Design an enzyme around this catalytic site. Sequence first.
Site, PDB file in Angstrom:
ATOM      1  N   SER A 127      -0.971   0.250   3.288  1.00 38.08           N
ATOM      2  CA  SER A 127      -0.132  -0.874   3.648  1.00 38.08           C
ATOM      3  C   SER A 127      -0.794  -1.958   4.484  1.00 38.08           C
ATOM      4  O   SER A 127      -0.108  -2.910   4.879  1.00 38.08           O
ATOM      5  CB  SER A 127       1.143  -0.391   4.332  1.00 38.08           C
ATOM      6  OG  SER A 127       2.030   0.142   3.371  1.00 38.08           O
TER       7      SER A 127
ATOM      8  N   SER B  60       6.281  -1.346   8.090  1.00 37.02           N
ATOM      9  CA  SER B  60       5.448  -1.056   6.952  1.00 37.02           C
ATOM     10  C   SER B  60       6.309  -0.911   5.694  1.00 37.02           C
ATOM     11  O   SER B  60       6.013  -0.127   4.794  1.00 37.02           O
ATOM     12  CB  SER B  60       4.566   0.122   7.273  1.00 37.02           C
ATOM     13  OG  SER B  60       3.516   0.221   6.342  1.00 37.02           O
TER      14      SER B  60
ATOM     15  N   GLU C 285       3.977  -1.704  -4.785  1.00 32.61           N
ATOM     16  CA  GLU C 285       3.997  -0.395  -4.163  1.00 32.61           C
ATOM     17  C   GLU C 285       5.143   0.453  -4.686  1.00 32.61           C
ATOM     18  O   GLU C 285       6.301   0.139  -4.453  1.00 32.61           O
ATOM     19  CB  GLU C 285       4.105  -0.566  -2.658  1.00 32.61           C
ATOM     20  CG  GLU C 285       4.033   0.734  -1.910  1.00 32.61           C
ATOM     21  CD  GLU C 285       4.239   0.641  -0.418  1.00 32.61           C
ATOM     22  OE1 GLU C 285       4.324  -0.506   0.083  1.00 32.61           O
ATOM     23  OE2 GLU C 285       4.341   1.702   0.245  1.00 32.61           O
TER      24      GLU C 285
ATOM     25  N   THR D  12      -0.870  -0.930  10.132  1.00 31.18           N
ATOM     26  CA  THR D  12      -1.376   0.336   9.650  1.00 31.18           C
ATOM     27  C   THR D  12      -1.393   0.451   8.132  1.00 31.18           C
ATOM     28  O   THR D  12      -0.784  -0.321   7.380  1.00 31.18           O
ATOM     29  CB  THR D  12      -0.512   1.446  10.247  1.00 31.18           C
ATOM     30  OG1 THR D  12       0.844   1.189   9.892  1.00 31.18           O
ATOM     31  CG2 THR D  12      -0.603   1.510  11.754  1.00 31.18           C
ATOM     32  N   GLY D  13      -2.103   1.489   7.666  1.00 31.12           N
ATOM     33  CA  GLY D  13      -1.906   1.993   6.325  1.00 31.12           C
ATOM     34  C   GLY D  13      -2.232   3.483   6.282  1.00 31.12           C
ATOM     35  O   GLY D  13      -3.114   3.918   7.009  1.00 31.12           O
ATOM     36  N   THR D  14      -1.548   4.219   5.417  1.00 32.15           N
ATOM     37  CA  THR D  14      -1.752   5.651   5.289  1.00 32.15           C
ATOM     38  C   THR D  14      -1.495   6.021   3.850  1.00 32.15           C
ATOM     39  O   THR D  14      -0.626   5.454   3.201  1.00 32.15           O
ATOM     40  CB  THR D  14      -0.850   6.470   6.233  1.00 32.15           C
ATOM     41  OG1 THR D  14      -0.784   5.847   7.513  1.00 32.15           O
ATOM     42  CG2 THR D  14      -1.298   7.878   6.413  1.00 32.15           C
TER      43      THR D  14
END
Length: 266
Positions: free
Chosen positions: A43, A101, A141, A210-212
């Site tokens: 993200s 997010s 997404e 962030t991104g995960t």
Amino acid sequence: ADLADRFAELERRYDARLGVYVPATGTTAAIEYRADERFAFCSTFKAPLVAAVLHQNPLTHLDKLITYTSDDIRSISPVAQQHVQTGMTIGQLCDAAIRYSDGTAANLLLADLGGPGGGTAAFTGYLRSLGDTVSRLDAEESELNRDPPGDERDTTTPHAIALVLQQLVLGNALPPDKRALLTDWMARNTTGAKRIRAGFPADWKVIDKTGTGGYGRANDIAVVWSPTGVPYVVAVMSDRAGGGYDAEPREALLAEAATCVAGVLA
């Protein structure tokens, strides 16, 4: 000493691949570790996505109401899934896409940009216009990114995304009024407490996105301000391609990498 040795030790301790870029400034050298290797966005693209929407519209656009259905809820969407009956304004979508997010919010912002691939081509073009010849967004997404490491789609590099963020938050890519909105949304992100923020002392300001994802993917892109007000861009990316599609992401790796960076910058 050599900071690269310390990053390498983090890789071995966490059984991970780590990417770091901090652009050089008027007073400091660049920090670079695997900075030109590709890593999935996850993200982290949502911060430049909001910039793209801001850039191409007057600020009155933030009041435009977007309506959508429960069938449009895709991926993790903490805000959008509570507002199916009301809709959300573009400004509210920008807020959610950064601070929570929110996947649906991002997909609606991509649609707001327009064109093939549900706005993903337009978004990539925005990055090209900022001098980024590397990054690419290829799909809307539908889930957190658990696509194979070998797939170049939906990737950036620490170097490329850092320089994008530099221009957006610290440079002149956006006029001041639009820049302020982006900065504030990142400043009040709710998802990043355990990443770059956890590696900088409390008297430093941190704003982030962030991104995960799968394969142990954990990223954080930030701008930080020292206790005397000097800014730095910090991009940290990581994955665990050898741990399988369900390898655990490690926020602590990003926090420790950020601690190493803070030690250089302080």
